[PDB]
């Protein structure tokens, strides 16, 4: 047959069946088969087997009818009820049209901007195991575009990430962290702003991560912190961070942590407290007090890491500094 947007009318209708009460025979199962076929039908409008995608009767009639039908929401709002390969296809569709530009405009980013709840449904997807990893894929594509990144970041619902990176399920919690890393690092200016303004409650929350029972959570959070402080755009956030004695004391204890990989990451944070020209009063108080015990520490610290140039140059820089007050 091959229709253009009777496919959109079909999907919409079948999903409606799949979301009503009982009927667990004949019709439930026949609706599930229909959603499958049409997500495929739809998926090949945009990609299209051994014949180019028609930059006309394909994308626009499909993109147009996706917006007017609100099918894009219905698929995220009901992602649950769809089958395995189904959720894989939904997410690939969602990603494709969200990437769609006509001109210098990305129409889907504009649509979502007015259908903001789609972003919030995706994010909230982390709390439902059967769909968490699919919502991560889709959410993370949204994040690629600054408007939407902004929507999630500035929402109060962003601090849900400090629960999500902490789940029970390792796969999911790891994916939560991926998104949460993507938010804070991709749109540099956006995230520099957010961090400057929300500093106090952000870092109060970030500090709980550095104390995690979960090894991955701790190691990765700590690794990220170092990336954030050392960034050029985050100059101001950095200065505030390295002025607080409670902060130095944590890093220095993390230098002496059970895990040598965590000690290593602690090093790249600790590194900047010392390289800092404009130190503050209790900064010096701890350094000079712990001088020499540090110069002794640094020399005999991760020497087995000689496949690494910079590291060994930074160590000789740090001892030079802790012997120069």
């Amino acid at each position: 047959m091959a229709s253009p947007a009777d496919i959109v009318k079909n999907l919409k209708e079948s999903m409606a069946v799949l979301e009503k009460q009982d009927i667990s025979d004949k019709k439930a199962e026949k609706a599930t088969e229909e959603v499958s076929k049409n997500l495929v039908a739809m998926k090949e409008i945009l990609y299209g087997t051994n014949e180019k995608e028609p930059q006309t009767e394909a994308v626009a009639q499909l993109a147009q009818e996706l917006y007017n039908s609100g099918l894009l929401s219905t698929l995220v709002a009901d992602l649950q009820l769809i089958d395995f390969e189904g959720k894989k296809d939904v997410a690939q569709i969602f990603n494709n049209i969200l990437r769609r530009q006509i001109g210098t405009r990305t129409p889907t980013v504009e649509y979502i901007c007015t259908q903001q709840n789609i972003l919030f449904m995706l994010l909230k997807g982390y709390e439902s195991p059967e769909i968490a990893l699919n919502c991560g894929i889709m959410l993370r594509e949204c994040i690629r575009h600054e408007p939407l990144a902004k929507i999630i970041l500035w929402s109060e619902q962003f601090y849900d990430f400090f629960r999500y990176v902490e789940m029970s399920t390792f796969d999911i919690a790891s994916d939560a962290f991926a998104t949460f890393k993507d938010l804070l690092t991709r749109h540099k200016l956006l995230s520099a702003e957010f961090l400057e303004q929300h500093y106090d409650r952000f870092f109060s929350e970030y500090e709980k991560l550095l104390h995690s029972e979960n090894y991955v959570t701790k190691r990765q959070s700590l690794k990220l912190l170092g990336e954030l402080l050392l960034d050029r755009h985050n100059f101001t956030i950095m200065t505030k961070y390295i002025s607080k004695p409670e902060n130095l004391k944590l890093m220095m204890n993390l230098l002496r942590d059970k895990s040598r990989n965590i000690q290593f990451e602690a090093f790249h944070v600790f590194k900047v407290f010392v390289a800092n020209p404009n130190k503050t009063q209790p900064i010096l108080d701890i350094l000079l007090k712990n001088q020499a015990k540090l110069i002794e520490f640094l020399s005999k610290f991760q020497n087995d890491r000689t496949e690494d140039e910079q590291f060994n140059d930074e160590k000789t820089y740090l001892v030079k500094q802790i012997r120069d007050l």
């Binding site: 004391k249 002496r256 701890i286 007090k289 712990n290």
Partner: peptide, 5 residues
């Protein structure tokens, strides 16, 4: 261990 303090 460190001097804290």
């Amino acid at each position: 261990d460190w001097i804290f303090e």
